[PDB]
Amino acid sequence: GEFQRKLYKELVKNYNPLERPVANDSQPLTVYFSLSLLQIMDVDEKNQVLTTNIWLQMSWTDHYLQWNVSEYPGVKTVRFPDGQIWKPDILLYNSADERFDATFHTNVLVNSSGHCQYLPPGIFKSSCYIDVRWFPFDVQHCKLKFGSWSYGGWSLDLQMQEADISGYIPNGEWDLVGIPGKRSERFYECCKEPYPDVTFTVTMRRRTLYYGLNLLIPCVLISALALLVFLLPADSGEKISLGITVLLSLTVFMLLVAEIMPATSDSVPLIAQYFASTMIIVGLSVVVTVIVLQYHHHDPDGGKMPKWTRVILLNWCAWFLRMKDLAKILEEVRYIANRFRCQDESEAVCSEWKFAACVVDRLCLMAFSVFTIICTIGILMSAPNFVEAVSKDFA
Amino acid sequence: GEFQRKLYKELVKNYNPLERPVANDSQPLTVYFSLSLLQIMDVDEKNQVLTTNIWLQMSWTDHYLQWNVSEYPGVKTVRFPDGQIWKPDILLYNSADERFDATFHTNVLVNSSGHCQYLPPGIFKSSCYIDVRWFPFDVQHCKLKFGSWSYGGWSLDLQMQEADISGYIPNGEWDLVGIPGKRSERFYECCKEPYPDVTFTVTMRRRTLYYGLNLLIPCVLISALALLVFLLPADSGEKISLGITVLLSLTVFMLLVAEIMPATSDSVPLIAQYFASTMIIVGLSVVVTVIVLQYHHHDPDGGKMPKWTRVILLNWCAWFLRMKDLAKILEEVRYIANRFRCQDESEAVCSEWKFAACVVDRLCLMAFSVFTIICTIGILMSAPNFVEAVSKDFA
Amino acid sequence: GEFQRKLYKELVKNYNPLERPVANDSQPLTVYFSLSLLQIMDVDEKNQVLTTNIWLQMSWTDHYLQWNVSEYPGVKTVRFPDGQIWKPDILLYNSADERFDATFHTNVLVNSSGHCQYLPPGIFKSSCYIDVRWFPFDVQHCKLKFGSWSYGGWSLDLQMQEADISGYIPNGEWDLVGIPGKRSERFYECCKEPYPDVTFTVTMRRRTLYYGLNLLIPCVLISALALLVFLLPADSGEKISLGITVLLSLTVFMLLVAEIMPATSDSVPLIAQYFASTMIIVGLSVVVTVIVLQYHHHDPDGGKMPKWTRVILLNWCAWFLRMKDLAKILEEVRYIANRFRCQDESEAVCSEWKFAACVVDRLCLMAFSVFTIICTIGILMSAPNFVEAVSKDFA
Amino acid sequence: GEFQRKLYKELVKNYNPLERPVANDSQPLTVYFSLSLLQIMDVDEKNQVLTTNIWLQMSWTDHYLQWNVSEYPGVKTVRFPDGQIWKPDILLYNSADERFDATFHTNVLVNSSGHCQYLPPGIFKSSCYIDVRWFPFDVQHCKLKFGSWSYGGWSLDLQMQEADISGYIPNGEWDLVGIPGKRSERFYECCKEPYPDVTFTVTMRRRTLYYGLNLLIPCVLISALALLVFLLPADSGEKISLGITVLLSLTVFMLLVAEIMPATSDSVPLIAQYFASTMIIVGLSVVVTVIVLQYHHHDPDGGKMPKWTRVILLNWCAWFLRMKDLAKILEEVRYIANRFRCQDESEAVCSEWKFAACVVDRLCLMAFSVFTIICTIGILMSAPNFVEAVSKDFA
Amino acid sequence: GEFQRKLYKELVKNYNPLERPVANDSQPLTVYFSLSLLQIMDVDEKNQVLTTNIWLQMSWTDHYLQWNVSEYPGVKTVRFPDGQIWKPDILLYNSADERFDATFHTNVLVNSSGHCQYLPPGIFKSSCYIDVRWFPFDVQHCKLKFGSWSYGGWSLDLQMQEADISGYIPNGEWDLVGIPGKRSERFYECCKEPYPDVTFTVTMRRRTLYYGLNLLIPCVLISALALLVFLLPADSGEKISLGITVLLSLTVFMLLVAEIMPATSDSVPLIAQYFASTMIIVGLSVVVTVIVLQYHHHDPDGGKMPKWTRVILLNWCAWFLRMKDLAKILEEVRYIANRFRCQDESEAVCSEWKFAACVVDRLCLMAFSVFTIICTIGILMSAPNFVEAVSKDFA
Ligand SMILES: *[C@@H]1O[C@H](CO)[C@@H](O[C@@H]2O[C@H](CO)[C@@H](O)[C@H](O)[C@H]2NC(C)=O)[C@H](O)[C@H]1NC(C)=O
Ligand SMILES: *[C@@H]1O[C@H](CO)[C@@H](O[C@@H]2O[C@H](CO)[C@@H](O)[C@H](O)[C@H]2NC(C)=O)[C@H](O)[C@H]1NC(C)=O
Ligand SMILES: *[C@@H]1O[C@H](CO)[C@@H](O)[C@H](O)[C@H]1NC(C)=O
């Protein structure tokens, strides 16, 4: 238009994009800083970074960009590109990013009274400590620290406005609890002037449904399947063939486990100690099976039974469980009869060893059942906010 | 040429690339916005982003770029680079991209009557919720929201033209249903002026052929192979050796399953519950086998059979299935005869236990056959648009 | 030098880098477009893109860059950077690239008669459909479509020169057949003027040596190893232990298979149906083995043999294969004799079941040998250009 | 403000951003260089690079940027963007980075007395040798070498200030020992002038908790589980079925091992030789088992025992371990009696072979127990700073 | 300073950064090109690219940048940024890079006599053929071809200086042999003028320690472990259970093999044929075992032995190996005696089949031992420079 052309030619005249737009040079320039969270992209435990989609919001008052609407009855707002008017240098302090800015400077909207508004959208990568001790029942607290790079409290004093979470697009894997802000002042031993900053703490909770369905169920099933070894009869030559195949399947399942579990060495994740306890239980099952088989295959050369060994496994442990011419012909045939009698005596004395082995199997079944139930329940129950996690996620 | 040189020297004189090219400053500038879809690149369920190849199309009318063709009888169109003439700032609102623009500003074609045309090609990355509850029989609805960044409805009012799908280059994995557009207006509690926008909804359907050939076939084959355990005779010492090897193969197959299934914790995908049901069936087969083997290896010390146990497995379940001097010589030889008689009696009483075990095996075969058929059919049939998916993809 | 300084100061005077360098403004500017292929980088079936190393070649005639050599007896050529002289905007239409250009604008060489030459080197990413139906015996046809972005046929008319393949640096995985070009004209219903373009079709053939050595050999070996089950004698309790271990090895081999086979759902690759047929054969071997073992372990309670079952497996199938006081003493000893006689009769009647099982094993060996030979030969032979692929690659 | 506008218009007048800001041109310009470490991102053994988050700090004195505060009673500091005032070109010499700079030039703060301050934040990628001989008990020494690119010691002489480690955000995987600095001078055979530089040596120690819990525990468990083979009785046909299944599980565990262990060929990592020793032990267990089984299944055709073989395994090795009409009737019945007697003699002579096999099993159990204990303890104990690593990490 | 300010204001006056800085325009400008190698980053066999860290070195003589030191007694060198003085356009011809330059133009140092020096550091990505026929005992020859983009031999003639390898930071995986240079001239059929270039050939040798410890050792161990099958006695039902478990472990080991071996189809790598020979040997072991077991389980219905079969396996092959009233009572008891006699005859005739099976096992052990020794030694020894590789790497 004919009016906004002369207004644009008038505004930029004798204008310097390096001076702070104030009227006295001794008064602070009030900048209202806010934030708008759009979504959470990824949370990396390897490099300890947090990727979010955030729209910043800045608003200050300029003094050299004021005009009377009466002389320009068709113009109410003007827009300037990046590098033609003064802009505050507020940027993320953490900013664990390659280019460190990730801001995409857009145009700057200015009203007719000098009130300037500016909101650059970008994807930020902050650096926060991730505590993985109670994985996967953990809760994180990551900080976003904004502030001016080279302006003090007497030149550009930051103010804070509540963050906006409208249009959050829930992540699905992480659940957002809230995002409060806080303004602080840092003093140096130079000048006795404040250095204000605005920090937003993003509090988020991990969802434990995918892990509880894809890691807990197969581990519990394999651990309970490993206990069937004691139920098998020793006559079938398939006891070790099951006891070691379960362990092989656990080893191949740890391959799927590995790609998920974090590799931090600061502490021991709860899922790691749970899987290690399960693995130790399955490992000791084979040793118990080996001892039971060493007791079942009793060669007929080691007596009947030691008194100390018998008096326990057949009287006390079995009580707790409630198991419960013609002369040559005569000499030729009585030898066969006595041979059969002696073989029957040998098999009768060797049957009790098999019965003791069955008793030992039942004892080990009870002991390992209570071991695995107690370990599996206790390890998961010991974690904090477990009841809150199951109540929110599962139910 | 001698004429277009002076025309170029004439057009840019007293021209400002920051003013909106209108003649009254109070009338809106009509901008016709369209879209051209070229292909769909990827659909990421991890970060919930959509990558597409899109050619935008913009068209407005300028006022300071008009010239009479008679004075320039060799020039009909002129082209200006980026940053020399006014261009609308229409850009994607979602734009889950690193640089947020991905536009590649090209030249701007202008006719001799001021009609300007401009179409920048680029690859866009929108952010949409992906609902994976019915994976792999799901249908998605992703939105592309375009609009002016800093112009109101009284300055730059958007119009919509139907999107073009000519030259679509079908993806192969995702099937496009359509892409309709809609223009909406958003009001603020400041000014009572519209803020128009143009949004395009991309509706696409997943193709279920690769999954139905590479995941369903091996799982069905393994599940049906696990049922052969009951058909085996108990004499061969190879029953557990098959029952647990099938489970080991299922565990190693879950490794291939894992890289495909999504990791979202918002809901349970249908393929996950189908594979979990198959795994539970294969797991319980081993427990049934253990009980059957515990019944086959009956030691000759526990009586013939309890009446309650016998009267079922041999009379009712077997009816439903329709299974159906010389004194010393005499004393020495009659002992052998009676020993043989007693051993034959013992083996005769122990044969019925094996027959009961065979009956139990047949019952478990029937029960597990109907269990696996019902589960496999029901889980897949319960999903919506399943008949549409199979009719379009397979047939 | 003293002369080229004044020549450079003379050429750029009153020069506009936006005007088309012609002398009448109504005559087309002839631009000769060529191409030089250096190597093929990658062919992606996931996103359907093609990455190549290409050196474009452009050549046109300028009019404002002419000088007489006599007045400058030391200067014959001059070079201008990007953005100081007019350059055609020829660029790839497909260009499935992030920045869409990938050109690296170099200097522009100009002769003393105005003949300008310019060749920018870059790495291009085109988008072409990849048909994977006959994988790995497939042949592709990918297109590279070049043309002016905003110039018509009456302003900038493209000409085509044959592509150069000198210095091709063969890929090793893909074999190049050729690269012919073609110039076409597209008409619009506006102006009745041509819109010329130049397109190059890159025809390439996949090399089938790595696949034929790393996928076909192990699959054939495993499939032929699975047939040894029928050769084993039934006395050894190791028949299922081999039949199911072969299947477990096939399942773990499919993990290596998975990372190679494409994931397109448009059609069924030939390697997928070949591996599926092999897997189905190995699966049915176990069912046949289960039936054979169910026939070998015949309990002595089911008669001798049904007439219909016997008359086939022992007369017809066996013919086709060409298998082929003292009273008490007497009562006490004749009982033992008759017991031995009856046990011998029972074992004699039970031997024929084992012989029938051996006959069934031989029949199944022949049937499965011909099944696997026919399937393996037919699936590979059915593909087109198979004889050409083996003749070129292997021999 | 009205004063800082004229101050900005005054400072840049007759100013050249290419001249070194001194007053005599023969005196060096003192530049104080420091460093601030924020975190360690990654340590790559593949390409031998180190990624860190570092905030440089530079401080020099300018001469043309001095003004009197009395004439500008509202201005105390001024800020200039990149490219408007002279800045030193100090940059990382190693800088194994794509763009080689990674600096993100910010504004430059200047006091009223000419004292200029400038601190650019960025992510650096240095190149250092990583010695992996004692993995995972290794300690590294990576260098960061800073210095001027094109200024000598008589123009820009570097000074060093102690690095700051406040706000270190511990990595979790690598433990920082310290970061001392040093200033050195390099002389050339041209000019006899120093070329100063500032180098910082980052000393870090690897944390051995994740490896000690996820690699040592399963390997020790599998190695000790492989020793149960000797404890098994030979009657059960399951000895090889365990001895080879343990080896199969070790082979599948090496897959998880592979993704962690480095691929450098300069030396042999300690974890590689430990896992190789474990694998060799498990391999030789099967050969010992094969020999034991070849001794257990003694066919009754090879005599009783060779004297040299017997006199050891039953007298010395067993002492060290402390194992410890009527004529036809008579001819018909005495033959049966003698046949039974001869069969009993044969089984009695064949029992001693089984006893010798048990003795051999016990000897091999003791020998392999001491072998595996000595190897496992010695390999880990031989590494340096092992006691320091366990004392700091575990306890 | 006061002098260098006027010197900088004097040098750039009437200066053009596009003219070649000579004094006659007909004389070539001598440019001395060198190179400095810092390290080798990666060698990719997939795309056939080579990534190196290289510092170029250029040096020419300018004519318009000369000043007398007496008039400027404080200035000896001046520095100009990129784009203010003329620089040669020497760049890598291969340059298989995205941006094709990767140079990071730094400042240009100039002496007081016009001697200009310039060395830009960068990371280059060349494209060279990698011959992988003798993997992992291969030696490569990759070329780096530098030259002027648009200057002939009569304008800018290149000279070559020997490359510098001081500070090489050895890679660890690749061993550098040397890097010689060569200057060549290319003539066109236009002008009869040279087009000089400078090319450096990087010769490097692969280190075979990691492969020789992580691939050769497990393959040899598994191959030698597979031979124990023949040593086992046939009485134990565990022969196939070992023969097929070894093959399963080999199949799972090929998964680790796959990620390392290249995927080029140009030729067959030596490691591929070695692993294939090992796999074929292990495969044929199972077939031999099946035949041996088919000979061990001889049913008592097929005669004693065919003469041709016996006369070899028991006379020749066993010689080469040096294996070596009362009437009813009488009728009732003589039947039992004759039954025992006939059963003893049957077992005596069936023992020789087992002995022949043992002889066959020993023959197959010898044959397969020599097969595997010859194959394993020959395949590795056939490669060139094998003795050099082992002498340098291992010893
Ligand atoms: C301008 O700022 C600089 C910042 O370093 C001041 O330099 C320091 O000033 C303090 C205050 O007296 C001294 O104690 C230090 O010794 C100074 N540092 C050095 C390296 O000399 C400088 O004094 C300030 N100038 C004015 C006029 O305020
Ligand atoms: C300016 O610097 C250049 C740097 O190369 C000097 O060139 C070398 O100077 C040494 C010193 O006499 C000679 O030995 C070499 O032969 C020169 N190199 C060449 C290629 O000629 C140059 O002399 C310096 N000029 C002045 C005036 O100091
Ligand atoms: C510069 O320094 C030198 C000695 O360092 C001195 O002789 C000379 O006078 C100084 N310059 C001025 C202008 O004082």
Numbering used by the authors:
A (entry chain E), B (entry chain D), C (entry chain C), D (entry chain A), E (entry chain B): 23 to 346, 432 to 502
Reproduce passages from the article.
The homomeric α7 nAChR is among the most abundant subtypes of nAChR in the brain. Each α7 subunit comprises an N-terminal extracellular domain (ECD), a C-terminal transmembrane domain (TMD) and an intracellular domain (ICD).
The apo-form structure, representing a resting state of α7, has an overall structure similar to that of other nAChRs. The overall structures of apo and α-bgt-bound α7 are almost the same. In particular, the pore profile of apo-form α7 reported here is similar to that of α7 in α-bgt-bound state. The narrowest point in the pore is located at L270 lying at the 9′ position in M2 helix, with a radius of ~1.4 Å, which is too narrow for the passage of a hydrated cation, suggesting a closed conformation of the channel. The apo-form structure of α7 has the narrowest ion channel with a radius of ~1.4 Å at 9′ position.
